[PDB]
Design a binder for this molecule. Structure first.
Ligand SMILES: Oc1cccc(-c2ccccc2)c1O
Ligand SMILES: Oc1cccc(-c2ccccc2)c1O
Ligand SMILES: Oc1cccc(-c2ccccc2)c1O
Ligand SMILES: Oc1cccc(-c2ccccc2)c1O
Ligand SMILES: Oc1cccc(-c2ccccc2)c1O
Ligand SMILES: Oc1cccc(-c2ccccc2)c1O
Ligand SMILES: [Fe+2]
Ligand SMILES: [Fe+2]
Ligand SMILES: [Fe+2]
Ligand SMILES: [Fe+2]
Ligand SMILES: [Fe+2]
Ligand SMILES: [Fe+2]
Lengths: 288, 288, 288, 288, 288, 288
């Protein structure tokens, strides 16, 4: 079973715009480069987000983390049993990602996934944000979450839960029109209420947004003003019905992909109960 | 010395509008009437806000509280020494306000003030809000605060500090134009960062707004949506530079008088230091 | 200034009934005798309540405590300045009361008061209740409180506050008839919300009741059942509007004198505010 | 006013016996010598107890500490006003005691007292006990306490309270015979329930005992066994009625002078109340 | 009485070197300029340290803060009574320093001091360090401390304590040679163990060093490595005997002026006791 | 599975030097002898470190602890299944080691290991350090850790994890030259981040160092100065990247074997994640 989401790689048309966005607006720390990919940090890991030039303007891959070598072999066993194709990353890839081992595969709809273990940490180069943010909530909960767009939620659910070991937290019927709603399924693989949400949205992107969680409410408030100064705000502040994350949304430089920046959600444990919600926000989140 | 702000009375042109506003939108509890004044509660006091019909569309009076009978006589002594005219409230007024004694006077610019002691409490009729609000922060800090508009800040400061015993917390230069700012003076008389702020604003109202503080951030979030549904929002959520109150503003039914609804400020004590700020918001509070 | 109420002495027609009442029902510890007075303990003091035979069926005296010898002399000075007659207790009385010194006087309406210091404690004979009670709340707050009946509340207030140093906490208008109420004044001399309450009740007793405070709510619950088994209950459980004590009342063997047995009130400090209440109970206390 | 007891000096006939006693049995740290005086530490101070050869076999002097230079001059002023003779310690004495200034005087019955300020600390030579003891409770409460034998308690009380600023905590009537008791007066000058107790005992020593307080109950338990192995125990474990110190007593090498080694007493503050006790122990302390 | 040390201004020969030093090595935030002075922040204040070109290579002035306007006038009164010359800062200076009022004077040996109130804060531009540091401990304790070199400690003590209201914490005899020591006097004006220390050192600088206190021990550890990479370390890590600050020292670009960077000292209150120490370090601080 | 590391035995050429080193410098308590082995304590166990004369100047054996008799038999079963030779310790050895049972074996490269249960404790002889140290962190985490030098890390890993039940925490690539690094594997068997680390170092010793963890940072600071006075320091203070232990290193009297003395690491639990680090220190640890 996947333990947490550890990294994201984007392929974008405007690297300089993404660079400014991730550092000056979001607050991530610039962390050099690996080949043609620019690297960004949010904590002690050598990198958390990679940005490389490309026409996709989308998520290129997502790194799914396990706790040790044996766990990785067990995942390989699960993939084999499920008939899911995969390739072991070679030395060059391991060195590029800074991991001790990885399996390369795709989800049922073409998103490359990399299951890995043994990521590099660099405590001798302590994290220093590029903008005022006290810090990000990562650790055992991983880097954050993202919404995976899919054409068949049922099929997507079978793969993420039966193969990768994610678990359903809850469902929100997200209103699309006067008489049309999309049942978004929010999935956890640790204490983070959701690490991946599945939704049949009509957008031409692999993902709808990625989310980062900051330590304080002020972190979120200040970030709002920075993104507003950049003219990127897509929602006012609000708080979600399901995880109680207080956040706002903004456009990334890649069309139709947003970032969510939030604080203070509830966490999940073994006693979690599946529920359904008719709205995404308990309050706020008006679209701008 | 005044211990806290205990009550506010408004004279307005649309009582039904104010009634709906205070109950369904703000969350106060309807508490009957006393003569032609409708009464509203925020806690265990018999009333905190009174609304009566009148062409003023403004604050008619403010109740300033002291802790006992001797304290009231000491205030009478201070008023006499300062040459400030006042009248002792008669039995009819005491019965109307539900207090054991009061002194009626005006500030240097015509706002009626009532210094009182011994207010009525009704614990046998526990507070029940008219809208979802976990509760208000009152107690020793009083009902909240208001911004007193004045034509001469220096003169106003001498009266409120030298006569009534308020103390300056800090000053914010509130930008009015490209090269014009108003030095707002925020005053305390207890732990509440400010109970009265003095400002030379060019509006034709005795006050710019009154403020209520709720127990939780969700209280504020939910209230925002209620006031937005009523079409009354004047500012987005934000957090102040001086008291760190997280709030939003909305129009009352009386033109040019707003309400501020907030949470989580810092409090003051004997070790407080006077400072100056160039902005009212550390983040947010964009005008709408 | 009086620091706390330390002891009470009753003169009663049925000593055996009072003995059973204080021990088997209330839970006090039998502590021998001193002359014709039976002694009862509630904590580490050698005694707290004394019961002696007499036709009064009433409170014979109340012991008011100060912290040291100098404090006692200062009280003697206050009594002299106020023109209040008093006599220094002789060795025999000091030995009888187990105190290092005392002043004997009366309040304006004939209740004997004894101001003392240096009471005897007996930690080598640890308190053991006669009925199931985890313990009583005494210490700096003294033994409890009592309601002093007076024919002139104003006169009584001047003596207790101006001479003895008690301070008004609040007032409750206790309804006596359809259009008649008695303004009961509750006074403190330490953290205990009230140690003495003054009221112009039409009963022929020096006091309306005395009160003891137990450590837990169960203490109160169990005591209710014991007093109910004895057929003495006068009120159901309830909670007061002013001090938030949760209690019930019961008859003592002396006609028209009750006992109040309670738990969990709020305490007072320097920031206390005088208020007025129209009811004695926020909930409960129905008369039985 | 004296702030705390800081040091004790003994003049004894058997220095080696005292050396072994203070180190191997009590647990103090050997700290070299100053002239013919051996020094012992209990914490960060350069020394706390001094032992020098002499026929007295008794306390030679006690050091009473104040917080600064001005405080010392104020004490000199009090001594002058009271007619108490004193001499300012010269440089040689200051250097010997390791203090910034001192006044040498005697109590009314010949015990030399030294009022000082600015004691030497040696944090670069951290305290290391000579026997298993987690540490001693000193700090603002000073080194411990002692019982001062006096022929006239009233006279002694006037000096210690009126001149030195000590305050009475309480009195215990210590039984000497079938119909004879000694009223011991326990005095504080800080949070320590008592720093000096005054008693008219019929022993030929300036003091009855000195006391040290350890951090844990085990400290006391282990110390008991060490002193028992040395054949010095004079009392079983017990707990005092007045300060609730749990301790035992043992003989020092000087006849009729004991040491008390204890733990866990209650402390005093401004709200302390004078009381009287008929026993020294709530439990235990049987004489051996 | 001075409440805290609020700012420091240096006049130096190598501004670029100081700029790099304060930002990349120490971690302060660059905050623009005011005239020919570069400004640096450590928290919410508009500035804390100023650096301007000059041949002094030394501290040009120190800002001493009070809590309000009345306090400033009271300081002016103290200066007048003491015969100390001073000039009220004009509008240009007030605007330059960003304060509501100030008095300009010098200490007895020529160090310019500025007593001020009403400093500017900029919460809308949250502090962002230039190097990895979780934050600095300032607030009521002010910016940090400095060691003031003086030729006459007695004279310096009279001015700082009798005129400015500082209070002696303790003294350390700092060894200079085999038989020569300098009695350094550490002074407080708030909870910070020392804000100014006075010492008769034989260096040709107004100050020996200034000190900044960080939130964590890691902050100090990481800063050590940064300053070591710059070749500026003058002492190994160590902990002081008097305040228990754990720190290290490094050279600033101005010859013979160092910076101390530390964490975790003890704080002082009304119960503080003057003591003397023979060493500056309980452990560590070896000179490099 | 091994539960913790309980004891270490060294065979050395200079017993007196080791004796002084372990007591006066490190702070261990001398605990007599057993045959030709000198014994040393760090807590309530009868002994933790043994030193005997021998030409090895190295670790002679390490004691690996299990919780009960059944656990020991289960370990014997694991050794048999794995084909690892072992001998049950006879009565003489059990008596020498003070254990209820033990199995004697060697790791793949000749280090004798003893798996035991039922160690002797001596609470009646409470631990007393020979130098100032508040205490050591042992308990369920065992005595500390050591770095086991091995010529084949893969082979060593298979034995320690597959046979003894240790688990990999993380890996650090320890730089040996400009283009050469050694992958050190840190292993846990309880909450202690590592109890044994495996590394292919080119030194001629069975171990690179052993480590003891003290209760406070001051413990470490003071120990540094003691070892520096002895001329044994090999590293400055620093903090590790993987366990966050703050420590320093020093030479033992046996050439090329060091001691690490530290404080405050993070602990591990079931949710631990394997990671890789490029440095041993987040800060400090410069070689001396
Ligand atoms: O973290 C989250 C929690 C709940 C809902 C959303 C969501 C809202 C709008 C569109 C897609 C998802 C979300 O992002
Ligand atoms: O509570 C408050 C704290 C700081 C500023 C304001 C304010 C803002 C705009 C206009 C008037 C006042 C305020 O209300
Ligand atoms: O403790 C108390 C607090 C408030 C009211 C009463 C009271 C009620 C009925 C009659 C007399 C007093 C009381 O006893
Ligand atoms: O600390 C103490 C507290 C109470 C009593 C004693 C005492 C007992 C016997 C003889 C003298 C004093 C004591 O030492
Ligand atoms: O903060 C401090 C506390 C104690 C001593 C010093 C000090 C040490 C060497 C030279 C000058 C001062 C210091 O800086
Ligand atoms: O406890 C530890 C944690 C991390 C690294 C080391 C280490 C450093 C240098 C050489 C060998 C090991 C260590 O001792
Ligand atoms: Fe989301
Ligand atoms: Fe406001
Ligand atoms: Fe009552
Ligand atoms: Fe004693
Ligand atoms: Fe310093
Ligand atoms: Fe190590």
């Amino acid at each position: 079973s996947i333990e947490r989401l550890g990294y994201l790689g984007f392929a974008v048309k405007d690297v300089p715009a993404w660079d400014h966005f991730l550092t000056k607006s979001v607050g991530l720390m610039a962390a050099g480069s690996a080949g043609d990919a620019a690297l960004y940090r949010a904590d002690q890991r050598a990198w958390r987000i990679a940005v490389q030039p490309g026409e996709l303007d989308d998520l290129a891959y997502a790194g799914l983390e396990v706790d040790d070598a044996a766990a990785l072999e067990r995942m390989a066993d699960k993939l084999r049993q499920a008939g899911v194709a995969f390739t072991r990353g070679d030395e060059a890839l391991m060195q590029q990602r800074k991991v001790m081992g990885l399996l390369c595969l795709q989800d049922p709809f073409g998103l490359p996934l990399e299951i890995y273990y043994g990521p590099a940490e660099i405590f001798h180069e302590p994290f220093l944000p590029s903008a005022p943010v006290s810090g990000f909530v990562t650790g055992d909960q991983g880097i954050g979450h993202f919404v995976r767009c899919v054409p068949d939620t049922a099929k997507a659910m079978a793969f993420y839960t039966e193969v990768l070991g994610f678990v359903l937290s809850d469902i929100i019927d997200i209103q699309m029109g006067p008489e049309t709603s999309v049942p978004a399924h929010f999935l956890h693989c640790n204490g983070r209420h959701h690490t991946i949400a599945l939704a049949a949205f009509p957008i031409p992107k692999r993902i709808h947004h990625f989310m980062l969680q900051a330590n304080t409410i002020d972190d979120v408030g200040y970030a709002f003003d920075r993104l507003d100064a950049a003219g990127r705000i897509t929602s006012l502040l609000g708080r979600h019905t399901n995880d109680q994350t207080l956040s706002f949304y903004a456009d990334t430089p890649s069309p139709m992909i947003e970032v969510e920046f939030g604080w203070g959600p509830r966490t999940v444990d073994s006693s979690w109960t599946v529920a359904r919600h008719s709205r995404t926000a308990m309050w706020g989140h008006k679209s701008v």
